[PDB]
Amino acid sequence: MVKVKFKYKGEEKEVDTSKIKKVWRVGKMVSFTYDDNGKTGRGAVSEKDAPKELLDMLARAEREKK
Incomplete structure (x- = not known):
């Protein structure tokens, strides 16, 4: 259940690690590409x-x- 659920393209979005480019803290928020x-x-x-x-x-x- 543990690909990354979030929001993009004006809908809910699920992304697999195969596609993840970067993750960091934008100060307050968890930010990824x-x-x-x-x-x-x-x-x-x-x-x-x-x-x-x-x-x-x-x-x-x-x-x-x-």
């Missing part, structure tokens, strides 16, 4: 509604930084 069939795209979530796998990828990043 993910891919769609060769073009990039930006995804984001707030912690309160960020399920575990999204966290896990961001987590190594965030812990390392902090």
Whole structure:
């Protein structure tokens, strides 16, 4: 259940790791770039509604930084 659920293209969006390009903290918010069939795209979530796998990828990043 643990591809990344979020919002993009004016709908809900689910992305697999095969497509994820970057994840970091935009200060307050979890910010990523993910891919769609060769073009990039930006995804984001707030912690309160960020399920575990999204966290896990961001987590190594965030812990390392902090």
